[PDB]
Paper text:
Toxoplasma gondii is one of the most significant parasites that impacts human health, with estimates that as many as one third to one half of the human population are infected. At the Center for Structural Genomics of Infectious Diseases (CSGID), the first Toxoplasma Structural Genomics Pipeline was established. The enzymes selected from the TDR database as small and tractable for expression and crystallization included: phosphoglycerate mutase II (hereafter referred to as PGM), nucleotide diphosphate kinase (NDK), ribulose phosphate 3-epimerase (RPE), ribose-5-phosphate isomerase (RPI), and ornithine aminotransferase (OAT). The genes encoding these enzymes were cloned, proteins expressed and purified, crystallized, and crystal structures were determined.
Ribose-5-phosphate isomerase is the enzyme in the pentose phosphate pathway just upstream of ribulose phosphate 3-epimerase, and it has similar functions, though it catalyzes the transition from ribose-5-phosphate to ribulose-5-phosphate. TgRPI has a larger α/β/α sandwich catalytic domain (residues 1–127 and residues 225–259) with the Rossmann topology and a smaller α/β sandwich oligomerization domain (residues 128–224). Residues 180–186 between strand β8 and a 310-helix (η3), Arg258, and Lys259 are absent in the structure due to their disorder. One D-malate molecule and two chloride ions were modeled to interpret additional electron density. D-malate makes hydrogen bonds with side chains of Lys8, Thr32, and Thr33, and several van der Waals contacts with residues of the phosphate-binding pocket of the active site (Schrödinger SiteMap score 0.97). CL 301/A is bound in the oxyanion hole of the active site and coordinated by main-chain nitrogen atoms of Gly105 and Ala107, side chain carboxyl group of Glu111, and two water molecules, HOH 415 and HOH 433. Applying crystal symmetry operations PISA predicted that TgRPI might exist as unstable dimer (BSA of ~2,430 Å2) or stable dimer (BSA of ~3,340 Å2) in the crystal environment. Homologous RPIs form similar stable dimers and, thus stable TgRPI dimer may be considered biologically relevant. Perhaps the most interesting feature of the determined crystal structure of TgRPI is the disordered region between residues 179–185 that comprises a part of what may appear to be an active site loop. These residues and 310-helix η3 are unique to TgRPI and might be important for catalysis.
Residue numbers in the entry: 1 to 179, 187 to 257
Amino acid sequence: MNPQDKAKQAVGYFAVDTYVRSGMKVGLGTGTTAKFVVERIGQRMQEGSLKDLLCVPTSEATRKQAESLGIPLTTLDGIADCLDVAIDGADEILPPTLGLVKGRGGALLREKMIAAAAKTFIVAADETKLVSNGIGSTGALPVEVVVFSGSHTKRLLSALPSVKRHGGRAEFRKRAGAAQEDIREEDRFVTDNGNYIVDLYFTETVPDLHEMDKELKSIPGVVETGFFLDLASVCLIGKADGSVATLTAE
Ligand SMILES: [Cl-]
Ligand SMILES: [Cl-]
């Protein structure tokens, strides 16, 4: 595998080895890094060191992967207390507050529901996910939006003061497939919750995340944002050489 994937693998395995134990209720992320987390839980099960485990997937792609490996699955409805731990990746990680940008794989809503329901929310990422001064340098800030009047909601997002200030441009997430100021409905990515996703790109770095998050949320039709603020408790960062750095809040 390439250097980036050895890093994603090392950090996923590490997360599972260090924080997951038998009898826990575990949240499972979505994406190429979470793939290795799921894969490691599957291995420890078969090896006999992980039992009586209840897991909650953040996407239908994640359940399908965990299903194919015999990992027990449910939703937050079937959990009485809180998840002990939730493990997921991130698209951007802003130390030292550990504010994140998530949602580039389309699963922001449930990832946030699962993260908020966990006593400890753990992010596992490779080194390229770390940013400085603010967000928006590696890509888009996703915003989940309802289907009805989606284009109009996209335009509203574009016009928010914080978004104009940072030179924001809006665009719909495309489904995997072929590809005027908007794309056609059949080409728009639909989340597991039946919603579209509006991606915001900026020409400059956005340093005030809390301010922007409130503005994005002031628009009716916005279901959820890619900002994960004051949620990550721990952020694991892996390198190709297999080592891992641990960032902790408080
Ligand atoms: Cl995602
Ligand atoms: Cl578009």
